[PDB]
Amino acid sequence: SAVKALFDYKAQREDELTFTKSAIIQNVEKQDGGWWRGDYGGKKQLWFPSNYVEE
């Protein structure tokens, strides 16, 4: 459900999260393809790279 960022990530497209290292991303929906959806920073269920986070 929640994950923690290992590195800063900056949204490159409208449908992506932006977060800083150590951030807690919530309500994570895992799927195939190396990107998951989650909640952070007022954005809901947007994409982020799964290799950016640990659980």
């Binding site: 590195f7 290799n51 950016y52």
Partner: peptide, 10 residues
């Protein structure tokens, strides 16, 4: 040393 995001297709 940040990982490469798997590049997204159009």
């Amino acid at each position: 040393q940040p990982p490469v995001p798997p590049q997204r297709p159009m």
